[PDB]
Scaffold this active site. Structure first.
Site, PDB file in Angstrom:
ATOM      1  CG  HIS A   8      34.733  15.466  52.024  1.00 57.73           C
ATOM      2  ND1 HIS A   8      33.720  15.435  52.959  1.00 57.73           N
ATOM      3  CD2 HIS A   8      34.301  16.274  51.029  1.00 57.73           C
ATOM      4  CE1 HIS A   8      32.719  16.192  52.545  1.00 57.73           C
ATOM      5  NE2 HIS A   8      33.047  16.712  51.377  1.00 57.73           N
ATOM      6  CD  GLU A  81      30.705  20.920  47.158  1.00 54.37           C
ATOM      7  OE1 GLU A  81      30.344  21.198  45.995  1.00 54.37           O
ATOM      8  OE2 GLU A  81      30.611  19.775  47.642  1.00 54.37           O
TER       9      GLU A  81
END
Length: 202
Positions: A8, A81
């Site tokens: 990202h 994450e």
């Protein structure tokens, strides 16, 4: 099959040097620019599957790269994450003072120390291992795009080519770039890392 890896774009936590984790930190105008450029960089790459992390910064990226393409998007929680618990949206300097012992134990032993009320690298690396074991379930796809995070994608590369989880740090995955890894009979070949060129299907 080929996995197209995209981390990202830039986020405000990155700008502020903060631990990100599961916290919803927004993409910065640079991160939108990084994802929009990636959309044109891989416009002519014919994906047939998109796997994305749950965190919205990854989904925001997957939207911008994809644009009007209308491809199927699987939300894989294994691609998330690492969960840093109480340490999310907080800075390294402040953590050494506010949570000295638990944070020092992490800085001195990142592979086994648990972030305060979070998940350790052992649980995180086992999540990625389960995702790797799930790839056979996608055996009928040819160009799978993966939108995730630095720790997930770097460790994915390391484990696929048969290295221990510790050596994930030999492959830093950059923002505004794309990578690709080929797998055939579970033999992984790293073909592209951190490119900013126009993609070409293999």
């Amino acid at each position: 099959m080929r996995l197209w890896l995209i981390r990202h774009g830039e986020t405000q936590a990155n700008v502020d040097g903060l631990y990100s984790g599961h916290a919803p930190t927004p993409l910065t105008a640079r991160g939108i620019e990084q994802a929009q450029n990636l959309h044109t960089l891989l416009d002519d790459v014919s994906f047939d599957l998109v796997l994305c992390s749950e965190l919205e910064r990854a989904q925001h990226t997957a939207r911008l790269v994809l644009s009007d393409r209308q491809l199927p998007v699987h939300i894989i929680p294994e691609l998330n994450e690492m969960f840093f618990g109480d340490w999310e949206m907080r800075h390294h300097r402040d953590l050494m003072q506010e949570d000295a012992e638990n944070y020092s134990a992490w800085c001195n032993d990142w592979q086994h120390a648990i972030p305060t009320n979070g998940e350790g690298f052992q649980a995180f690396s086992q999540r990625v291992e389960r995702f790797i074991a799930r790839l056979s379930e996608y055996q009928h796809y040819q160009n799978i795009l993966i939108v995730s995070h630095q720790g997930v994608l770097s460790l994915l590369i390391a484990r696929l080519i048969g290295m221990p989880a510790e050596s994930m740090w030999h492959f830093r995955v950059d923002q505004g770039c794309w990578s690709a890894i080929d797998i055939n009979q579970k033999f992984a070949t790293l073909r592209v890392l951190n490119s900013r060129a126009i993609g070409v299907e293999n």
